[PDB]
Amino acid sequence: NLVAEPFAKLEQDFGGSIGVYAMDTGSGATVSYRAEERFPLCSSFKGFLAAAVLARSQQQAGLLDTPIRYGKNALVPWSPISEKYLTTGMTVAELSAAAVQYSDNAAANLLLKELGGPAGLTAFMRSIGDTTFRLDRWELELNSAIPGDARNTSSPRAVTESLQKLTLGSALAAPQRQQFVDWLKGNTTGNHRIRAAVPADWAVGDKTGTCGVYGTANDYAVVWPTGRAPIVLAVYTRAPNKDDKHSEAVIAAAARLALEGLG
Numbered sequence: 001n002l003v004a005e006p007f008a009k010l011e012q013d014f015g016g017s018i019g020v021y022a023m024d025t026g027s028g029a030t031v032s033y034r035a036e037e038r039f040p041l042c043s044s045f046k047g048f049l050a051a052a053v054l055a056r057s058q059q060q061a062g063l064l065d066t067p068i069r070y071g072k073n074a075l076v077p078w079s080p081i082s083e084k085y086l087t088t089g090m091t092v093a094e095l096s097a098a099a100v101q102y103s104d105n106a107a108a109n110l111l112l113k114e115l116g117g118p119a120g121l122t123a124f125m126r127s128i129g130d131t132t133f134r135l136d137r138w139e140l141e142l143n144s145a146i147p148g149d150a151r152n153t154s155s156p157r158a159v160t161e162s163l164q165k166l167t168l169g170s171a172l173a174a175p176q177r178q179q180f181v182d183w184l185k186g187n188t189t190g191n192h193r194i195r196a197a198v199p200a201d202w203a204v205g206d207k208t209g210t211c212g213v214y215g216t217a218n219d220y221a222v223v224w225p226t227g228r229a230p231i232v233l234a235v236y237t238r239a240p241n242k243d244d245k246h247s248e249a250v251i252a253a254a255a256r257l258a259l260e261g262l263g
């Protein structure tokens with residue numbers, strides 16, 4: 001597979017495994033490398049979490065507008081938004097933006113509670129036709145990234161297919177699809193991943209994940225090239241040793257090869 005050779009060289013230099021899926025929604029063209037292998041989700045579940053909350057918000061009138069009045073017991077390390085609004089509370093919409101754009105852990109856990117926990121998010125992903133996605137822990141308990149553990153994993157292909165359904169397809173009603181897209185476009189944590197691979201003129205929405213252990217980190221994105229239909233892509237990494245370091249540069253490099261390989 002000549003298309004695959006640069007991805008194999010990249011993951012060999014990195015000391016692990018890289019999984020890539022990219023789909024051009026204009027051509028139908030794809031690039032695939034280990035696309036159906038499982039990789040840890042890490043914080044990247046929070047994008048799908050926000051989409052599941054938007055889906056619920058379609059039939060639960062005013063759900064997104066609902067103030068959640070949480071206590072200190074709800075706070076988690078790296079909850080910089082939730083900690084700031086601890087007096088006044090946050091709406092479900094504000095919690096969703098914090099979870100997506102800052103990876104706020106308390107916000108992610110409050111939204112998981114809205115859905116019936118990790119099992120509720122998994123059930124939402126099954127409802128849109130994703131059979132690969134698995135989540136069974138709350139933050140910060142889903143991040144062990146142990147090689148061969150299928151818990152708290154998905155595949156680059158399933159992530160890309162689900163992201164397309166939610167951001168571009170019909171899995172959400174249009175006003176909810178639009179809110180999901182705007183949350184992803186405002187992500188603050190992905191500047192060195194897929195965003196570093198795309199021409200500066202192209203709009204990007206993304207969500208990152210970083211377990212760090214076992215060289216584990218990821219990003220998925222919708223990309224709007226000038227004058228073209230969007231591209232959806234996912235890049236996930238892992239490595240065999242607990243102290244193997246993740247690399248943002250390797251994720252950006254894999255994203256460039258994906259864009260270069262599209263027909």
Ligand SMILES: *C(=O)N1C[C@](N)(O)CC[C@H]1C(=O)NC1CCNCC1
Nearest residue numbers: 042043044078102103143209210211
């Ligand atoms: C998400 O992937 N994520 C990283 C972690 N190591 O798994 C811990 C939980 C979560 C997180 O808190 N990310 C923050 C992103 C912004 N800087 C602080 C960490």
